[model samples]
Target: HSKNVKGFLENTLKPYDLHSVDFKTSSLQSSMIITATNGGILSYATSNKNSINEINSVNNLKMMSLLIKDKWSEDENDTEEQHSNSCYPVEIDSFKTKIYTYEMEDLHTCVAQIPNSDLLLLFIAEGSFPYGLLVIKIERAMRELTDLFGYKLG
Candidate 1:
């Protein structure tokens, strides 16, 4: 099972490897974990509440339009003051990549914004599909969700 799982995970990958990602938050961030399959696992934590609060304050209505049309900043900080002051528009209808590794005494970080329309398409087609049309619809729906979540690839 493990071998098959590993094969399943690797066989569909493209030539590139991803290391990170970013998203909005509404309150002081505590901790979050997300796996991008092809992008690698991302785990991040922030002790400040400003990032969390910023997410909480976003108007969903405005978010719908502003996120796609405006630019947004994805940086969060460890200090309450910096977190509060570093606010701006960021394009959520896009995907950001990053990489992280932790050592016994230290940590590492890397971030990037890259294209992944194919990755997103493959992500949606996994598991089961009885028809080609279903796969196409799934891809479209997944793309739309990324938009609602303020991220996408073209």
Candidate 2:
């Protein structure tokens, strides 16, 4: 299935690389702990923020979180304890290691943490029929909500 999608993306969106991005996975129930490099790019446009705000304003905010960490290490002498909770603030050290937890009600929904940005946090109640794979498949996801919607960005 992935190969078919990749082939289509390659032909349709020339000059663009498509693949899974790097990430860690740890499932307590499934007893699966896999941390590997999932290739691809993660993008978040300003428009996405407006949609998020609109969702929140309408009291339709979905459950999700975004973990942001600095690219560099922090001071070892810092006394601030890491956030070790299962929730959003779980054990963030000065070394810039953070854990963003998004609790979804079902397996159908998926979440992503955009790399190297203070920008993160996206929640969707539903999608255009076939979803989930949208993240794993690039090019096909040419425009995010942020890009489609209008928003003032930096």
Q: Which lDDT values do the candidates have, in the order given?
A: 0.28, 0.28
Model 2, range 81-106, lDDT digits (tens) per residue? 43221222211121122222222344
Question: Per-prediction TM-score, please?
Answer: 0.18, 0.25
Off by over 4 Å in 2: 1-57, 62-103, 121-132, 137-154
What's model 1's TM-score? 0.18
* Number of the top TM-score candidate: 2
Separate clash counts for every candidate: 20, 10
